[PDB]
Symmetry: C3
Subunit: 386 residues, 3 copies
Amino acid sequence: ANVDEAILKRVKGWAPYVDAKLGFRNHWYPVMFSKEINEGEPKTLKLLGENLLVNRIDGKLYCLKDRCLHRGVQLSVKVECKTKSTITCWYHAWTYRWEDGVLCDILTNPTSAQIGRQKLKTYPVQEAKGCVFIYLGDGDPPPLARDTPPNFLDDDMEILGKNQIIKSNWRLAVENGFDPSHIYIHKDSILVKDNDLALPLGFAPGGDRKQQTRVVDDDVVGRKGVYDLIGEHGVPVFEGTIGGEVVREGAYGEKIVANDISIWLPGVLKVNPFPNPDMMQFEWYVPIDENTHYYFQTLGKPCANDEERKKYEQEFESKWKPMALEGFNNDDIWAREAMVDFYADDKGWVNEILFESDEAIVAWRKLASEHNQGIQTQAHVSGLEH
Amino acid sequence: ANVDEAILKRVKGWAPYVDAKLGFRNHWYPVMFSKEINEGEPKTLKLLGENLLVNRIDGKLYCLKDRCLHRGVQLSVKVECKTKSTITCWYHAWTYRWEDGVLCDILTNPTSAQIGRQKLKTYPVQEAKGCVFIYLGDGDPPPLARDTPPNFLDDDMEILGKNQIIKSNWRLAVENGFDPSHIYIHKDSILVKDNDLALPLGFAPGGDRKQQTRVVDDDVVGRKGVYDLIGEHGVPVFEGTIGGEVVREGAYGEKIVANDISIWLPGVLKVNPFPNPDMMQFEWYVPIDENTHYYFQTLGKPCANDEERKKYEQEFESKWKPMALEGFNNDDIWAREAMVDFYADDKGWVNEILFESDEAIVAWRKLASEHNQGIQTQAHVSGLEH
Amino acid sequence: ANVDEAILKRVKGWAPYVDAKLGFRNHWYPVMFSKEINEGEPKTLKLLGENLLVNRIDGKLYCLKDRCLHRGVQLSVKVECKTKSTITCWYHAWTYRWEDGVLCDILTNPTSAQIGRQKLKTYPVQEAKGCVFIYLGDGDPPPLARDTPPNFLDDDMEILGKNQIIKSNWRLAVENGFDPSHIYIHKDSILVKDNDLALPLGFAPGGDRKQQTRVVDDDVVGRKGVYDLIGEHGVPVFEGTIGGEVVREGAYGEKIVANDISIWLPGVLKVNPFPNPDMMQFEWYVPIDENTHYYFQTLGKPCANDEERKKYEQEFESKWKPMALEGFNNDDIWAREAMVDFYADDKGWVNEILFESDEAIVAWRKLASEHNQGIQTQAHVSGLEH
Ligand SMILES: Oc1ccccc1-c1cccc(O)c1O
Ligand SMILES: Oc1ccccc1-c1cccc(O)c1O
Ligand SMILES: Oc1ccccc1-c1cccc(O)c1O
Ligand code: FES
Ligand code: FES
Ligand code: FES
Ligand SMILES: [Fe+2]
Ligand SMILES: [Fe+2]
Ligand SMILES: [Fe+2]
């Protein structure tokens, strides 16, 4: 659908992942924080190439396609919400219900035969952990847990975060995050010194292929992911040599982090524990279009009462956001950007030369290829045909 | 020629209009005001995708293609008019007559065999009502009146105006202007209050389909257009309801405007009377390229002597330009812009969902499809082949 | 390979030149001055569409493709030269030798099976006359002299220069430089007055076709070029007439320049003598990509000792650079730019209408078509396929 068929033949058995340049349909995706959208103040965003409107009405979130059925304009060019339950297109006043998208009135012609006989596309929206998730899919949504990493939705788990727009395809972001050897780029992070981390330069793998990862297709809520097990039979590399001469060393700190690393559909990474031995990082790479993604970062820490939550919030702001989310992950951002050119023409997928640690990524490409709930296409974006 | 043949099959009987993304050839178009081009001061513009040069020589206008026959450079990069009757290309001095475009000399080789045996394309130019019209066509031009709305060329009719470049396809501009229900966008215009207009929100049409418009193919000078007759059997809407609740009202002023509205080939709208009961608006949407048009606005008012003309000019400057041409039509401009995305891939023409007032636009699409004097193509732009 | 096959059929026997939009492979090209690259300070550039890294190591130049074999990132995003003889990719520390491009180590996995079994592309580099030349080709390079104009590599010849990036295809630059009638554009140059040059407006050619040029395929070092002989049987034009009236004259100075003019593969012009009767100009138009070239200007003057070289350098800086390289050749730059649009769609090659002086260019197109060492393609740029 999205990629030259000749390229897809050459990547037999990751073909669906390579074709998924616009992301996977029929999954939940986070797109903003609860606090960023107030009652009766609609917001625009693009998700899987589709312009959407989100509104809060009586505290509850509704999502409509931001495209009038009449002449295809964005309603958001000029929002006219003239009753709590509706939005009126600024152009000829076609009026839609937030709840089901039905065209319930037209101000310019209250006798039109279109009234009650057209419906704008809606998508389910759910808040959880102060995060807004949209189900960019058709039919009844699965439970959110299916599309979230283990422990993200535990009651005591306190989630704080940052979101921004990054100029790479979402897959470059996923692959970079789940890439065992990419740790090399983090070797000079401020967070490595100022939080005393142990961080290898890389890994000398051991064991067979299958032992490099755990493929999860047996989780009870239907989650699908891969654990990076390179450290189980593998030896960490702390001395980097060229011609046998030591030219770089890893970091010899006390704090042990990233005991478990896992990537889940539709494209969320869990690193545990990180950036501190008492915390978790969950980050999403959410497809906006083929060139762009939301880098939706969250840090989870169990909190037992309001006091622990106050405490957490204060170190999040003063330490963990500037030192980890920025000071550690900024390098991830420009690593992703550096892969764009080679993958832009879809040929990177056939001309890359992989090495042993890339077995984690291969396993993700196969898991995504097989367990995704649908390939988003340009036809989904441009609509059904009249 | 311009649009995927599969899309053209799906719009049977507006096909030629849908294909006409570069405009219609063999029509007159206004491109600037007389006063903007002085004796011996040539100007560049693009029209139907073609770069043109216009010059005033002994008070009379001449138009040449701004593209040297030799290496395809624009002569306008550096104009060398070295005799009244000629222009010399800055590059190898190939020299052309303004009057007929004939290559009459080459300064770099006065013995060249090309001399007298090559001719640059010319187009007829005519001034009328202080407006410059170019016939972007081949052969002897028709009379200007064919390509102008009724009454624009009456002797007493005093024409004043504004021109600018707008970033939409010309057809989006035409359709917006002739769109009976688009009046909704004008509901908050400064001109509606400060000139006390009656302005409905829209119309509940009545009568049959044929009664919604008058198709003119019987006018004596060969004009072809459509009158919007929605108001004849239709009821104006002044109260906009959602779920039966009044949420917006129209404007209840004294001044009656836009009794007659008509769109003519090649793409000029006449609204009478407007913006005042003693005036007319004629506005053109002139194709520059596929993404761009001149929004050539004029206001006509009968003046019987120099005194009335002085009077007119002074209210034009102080009131009608800032309050109407800008304060009313600015909303038209961004309405046109808002349609670009849906029509950019040529699919809007098949995926729009029209309603009853769009019968005016359908009638225009059929009139344009049938009575246009030619479809401009990329081959017209890039030239005949050697 | 690069141009619609239907266009190539229509230019039978310049087809290879018309297809060579990315330049000719298996030739030497100058890309920078010796002084611009210091010991251990690597530089990035693009040549024939390929991103390259150049380094100076123990005073000697090495060139590697700036593209990691692993995930296709540019090593130059963050250079890590951790031993004199190597460069380590910033991403997973794949480490390459400058000398042969062999992947000799990976810091992230010193046990990888890739080590010693992969090789990054290298290109030969040679300095001569304080100019850096790269052989953008495969196999053992020919001697540099093959790809340089006569006399450029004479021991006494002192070479000084300027380089910059110009936004046209390299062929527009070549053709402009070797274009006998383009001298018209130089008629108002500051250098024409302030250095008292004789400069015609153009030429009335005489003799037959073959006498307009000397095609050199008989030079002993394998050089291939064309001499412009228009002035041998031709008459210079000093009076430009329109309808027999003199409207422009040439320049009637004392200093005779440009007695011999020659264009050589891969695309270097020699004008002798110029810009002074005791000097030579050699300028290259080096393909960067399809839209861009290095305009690599040099002035050669025989110097017999360090004193003459000091003298030369001082007038180069104070006079010849600002007055000639800039004050004369700046017009060349915007002439080249003015041809871009007509040649952008590859149709200029069929729709141009040539005249008698263009016989020099035709002869160059045939010489290039026949004696080029290879056509650079997008496949050379994007690589061999896995
Ligand atoms: O993925 C990792 C491996 C080892 C140490 C830290 C990380 C890590 C944590 C959060 C986000 C990332 O991109 C990481 O690379
Ligand atoms: O087209 C109209 C319909 C009703 C009231 C005013 C206008 C009008 C007049 C001039 C230019 C326009 O775009 C209009 O919409
Ligand atoms: O090519 C030329 C012909 C006659 C006089 C000067 C030149 C010349 C010298 C150096 C570079 C150029 O582009 C020229 O046109
Ligand atoms: S485009 Fe929205 S009502 Fe017409
Ligand atoms: S391009 Fe105009 S004379 Fe050569
Ligand atoms: S991209 Fe260079 S080592 Fe991985
Ligand atoms: Fe990372
Ligand atoms: Fe309007
Ligand atoms: Fe020149």
